[PDB]
Amino acid sequence: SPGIWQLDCTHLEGKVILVAVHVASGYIEAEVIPAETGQETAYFLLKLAGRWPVKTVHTDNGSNFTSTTVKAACWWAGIKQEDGIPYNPQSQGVIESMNKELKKIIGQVRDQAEHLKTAVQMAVFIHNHKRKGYSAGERIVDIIATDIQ
Catalog residues that contact Cl ion under the rule CB under 5 A.
53, 128, 137
Q: Which is nearer to a second copy, 16 or 122 (CB)?
A: 122
The residue length of the chain stands at 149
- Please answer whether residues 70 and 46 qualify as being in contact, where contact means their C-beta atoms are separated by less than 8 angstroms: no
Q: How far is the CB of 64 from a second copy (least distance, A)?
A: 17
The count of other CB atoms within 10 Å of the CB of residue 87 is 6
Question: Minimum Å distance from CB 41 to ligand S8Y?
Answer: 8
Footprint of a second copy on residues 127-146 (CB under 8 A)? 128-129, 137-138, 141-142, 144-146
* 32 in Cβ contact with 117 (< 8 Å): yes
Q: How far is CA 43 from each of CA 10, 52, 77, 129, rounded to the nearest angstrom? A: 18, 15, 11, 25
Nearest to 83 by CA among 109, 107, 54, 62: 62
- For residues 133 and 63, what is the distance between their CA atoms, to the nearest angstrom? 38
User: Does 135 help bind ligand S8Y (rule: CB under 6 A)?
Assistant: no
Verify binding: residue 112, ligand S8Y, rule CB under 6 A: yes
The CB-of-130 to a second copy minimum distance in angstroms stands at 11
Per-residue binding letters, 56-95, with a second copy (x by CB under 8 A) = --------------------xx------------------
* CA distance to 21, 40, 49, 76, 149, per residue, from 69 (Å): 21, 9, 15, 10, 34
Binding residues for a second copy, rule: CB under 8 A, are 29, 43, 46-47, 49-53, 76-77, 112, 117-118, 121-122, 124-125, 128-129, 137-138, 141-142, 144-146, 148-149
